[PDB]
Design a protein around this ligand. Structure first.
Ligand code: HEM
Ligand SMILES: CC1(C)[C@@H]2CC[C@@]1(C)C(=O)C2
Ligand SMILES: [K+]
Length: 405
């Protein structure tokens, strides 16, 4: 359904893009969003979909807006407006200066030091999961690896029972790619309903898990509040359950379809880290935004206070103006430009954990299952939202071509 056009929005800037169900989704979700970068499309457009909002379509504008938190606030970062208004995770729903103090605490539980710590367990799980699948000659990658690998690592880090995954994964997904059964607010409240007693228990009897660390932590030298801890833990859960999980599938779908790229990483494993970065660019998958804090003229367009603007992190790296032949994948690409992990004061705090999980996955999978393909006659379908993903990824391979070790 289309929302009536606001008085200040000119008809020539209207492009009814639906971030939750883009028109050309069948061509691939990144390709679907890339339609916003076709010749006849302005740098900044207005869509009447999902309540009505602006969309910056080029990396230059996306980066500029993420840098200017004075005009583009993170207070209401999600579309539709109801979701943006209910969204109160920390530090994401805050603008500097108040936002900053919380980043250090979050870094304590998902930062580099923690990643180096988890390395062995991460490697161990990747190898265990892949070796169990190897002899089968087939798998449903989304449920057999993409989900269990990153999620079990996060549940371990957070000290939560793996039996809780189905419930938590359902809630997380309603906040990024809602099925319609729950509003963002209802999903958020359910997630908080889950966390509240756990946070209280771990503030009473602290453990060494991420929730205990956050719940008993300090920010700028003072005690974090129970509510603040809840709002931060909610964000961590979403990050651990709906980011890398989706990215791994986009990456594996690509590798399954491109033997040449597979062979390259097999023959020259030292290129895996670079490959990871190029894949993060080509299969970028996040798209949230900001809300205008005041009337503001941006790139010749009059924006009004209260207007929401989607700033697709996904689009920056796909912009031909940032990377030549953007849809092409080259592991030797010189200057890989992208904003896959965000831009500005809210740069992703879990990017180190993410990269480690991606690299370990590429290395351990290609080592054991070097040759695999999309299952016969399968047509991979993608899904779009705040974080886009892959609905299903059936893969097949000849066990005789695999290596057990
Ligand atoms: C492929 C994986 C990932 C991608 C593409 C990604 C992307 C992003 C992006 C684009 C933002 C900025 C949002 C904004 O400015 O509104 C962000 C923030 C954040 N991410 Fe990630 N992320 C990933 C994985 C993770 C993981 C595994 C964690 C750990 C749970 C994590 C924790 C966070 C946190 C705590 C923030 C908030 C930073 C702040 O608001 O100051 N992320 N991420
Ligand atoms: C946009 C994000 C990818 C980032 C980490 C999880 C996420 C869904 C948020 O709400 C902030
Ligand atoms: K809000």
């Amino acid at each position: 359904n289309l929302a009536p056009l606001p008085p200040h929005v000119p008809e020539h800037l209207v492009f009814d893009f639906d971030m939750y169900n883009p028109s050309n989704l069948s061509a691939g979700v990144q390709e679907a969003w890339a339609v916003l970068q076709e010749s006849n499309v302005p740098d900044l457009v207005w869509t009447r979909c999902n309540g009505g909002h602006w969309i910056a379509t080029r990396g230059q504008l996306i980066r500029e807006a993420y840098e200017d938190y004075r005009h583009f606030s993170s207070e209401c970062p999600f579309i539709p407006r109801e979701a943006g208004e209910a969204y109160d995770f920390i530090p994401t729903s805050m603008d500097p200066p108040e936002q900053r103090q919380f980043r250090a605490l979050a870094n304590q539980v998902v930062g580099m030091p923690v990643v180096d710590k988890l390395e062995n367990r991460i490697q161990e799980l990747a190898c265990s999961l892949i070796e169990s699948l190897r002899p089968q000659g087939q798998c449903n990658f989304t449920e057999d690896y993409a989900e269990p690998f990153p999620i079990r690592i996060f549940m371990l880090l957070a000290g939560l029972p793996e039996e809780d995954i189905p419930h938590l994964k359902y809630l997380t997904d309603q906040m990024t790619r809602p099925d319609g059964s729950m509003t963002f607010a209802e999903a958020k409240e359910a997630l908080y309903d889950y966390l509240i007693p756990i946070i209280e228990q771990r503030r009473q009897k602290p453990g060494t898990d991420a929730i205990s660390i956050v719940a008993n932590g300090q920010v700028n030298g003072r005690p974090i509040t129970s509510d603040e801890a809840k709002r931060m833990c909610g964000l961590l859960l979403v990050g651990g359950l709906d980011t890398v999980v989706n990215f791994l599938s986009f990456s594996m779908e690509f590798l399954a379809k491109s033997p040449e790229h597979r062979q390259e990483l097999i023959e020259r494993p030292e290129r895996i880290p670079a490959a990871c970065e190029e894949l993060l660019r080509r299969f970028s998958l996040v798209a949230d935004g900001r809300i205008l804090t005041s009337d503001y003229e941006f790139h010749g367009v009059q924006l009004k206070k209260g207007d929401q603007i989607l700033l697709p992190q996904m689009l920056s790296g796909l912009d031909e103006r940032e990377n030549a032949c953007p849809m092409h994948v080259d592991f030797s690409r010189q200057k890989v430009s992208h904003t896959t992990f965000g831009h500005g004061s809210h740069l992703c705090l879990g990017q180190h954990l993410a990269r480690r999980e991606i690299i370990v996955t590429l290395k351990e999978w290609l080592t054991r299952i070097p040759d695999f393909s999309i299952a016969p006659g399968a047509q991979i379908q993608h899904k779009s939202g705040i974080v886009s993903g892959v609905q299903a990824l059936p893969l097949v391979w000849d066990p005789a071509t695999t290596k057990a070790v």
